[PDB]
C-alpha cells in the first residue's frame, strides 16, 4: 500500500528531475564529477552526488520524501561550491541551477502536500 502512495510520488520527482537537468544544458552535473578529470575530488568532496545517481535512485523508489530528493539536489549545488572557485564555469552554473531551480521545487512543494 504504502508502495501504491509512494508510485504517485516517483511519478511527480521524475518529472521535476526532468526539468531540473533542463536547467544544466551543459550537463556538468549530469553524471558523476570525473575521477579521470579530477583525481583528488574524493578528497575534497565527501558525497558525490549527480543527476544520474538521483535518477537510479528514484527509478528504485528510493526517495520516500520530497525533502530527500531535496537534499540530494542539494548536494549537487554545494559541494560543487566548495570545490570550484567562484569566477568558475562550474560555480556558476551551479548558481543558475540552484536559482532556476528553486522555482522548480517550490511548485513542486505545493503539489506533494496535496
Ligand atoms: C570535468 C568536470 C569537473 C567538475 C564537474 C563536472 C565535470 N564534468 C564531468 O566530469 C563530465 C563527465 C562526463 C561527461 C560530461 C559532459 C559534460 C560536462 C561534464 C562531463 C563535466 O563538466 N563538476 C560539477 C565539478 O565540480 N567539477 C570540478
Redesign the pocket.
Known amino acids: 500500500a504504502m508502495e501504491l502512495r509512494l508510485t504517485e510520488l516517483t511519478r511527480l520527482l521524475r518529472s521535476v528531475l526532468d526539468q531540473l537537468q533542463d536547467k544544466d544544458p ?9 575521477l579521470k ?2 583525481p583528488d ?1 574524493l578528497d575534497h568532496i565527501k558525497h558525490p552526488m ?1 543527476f544520474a545517481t538521483m535518477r537510479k535512485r528514484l527509478e528504485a523508489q528510493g526517495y520516500k520524501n520530497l525533502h530527500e530528493f531535496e537534499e540530494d539536489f542539494d548536494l ?1 549545488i554545494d ?2 561550491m566548495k ?2 572557485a567562484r569566477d568558475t564555469v ?1 560555480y556558476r ?2 548558481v543558475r541551477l540552484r536559482d532556476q531551480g528553486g522555482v522548480v521545487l517550490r511548485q513542486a512543494r505545493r503539489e506533494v502536500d496535496s
Open positions: 551543459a550537463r556538468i552535473f549530469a553524471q558523476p564529477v570525473s578529470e579530477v575530488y549527480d549537487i559541494n560543487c570545490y570550484n562550474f552554473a551551479a
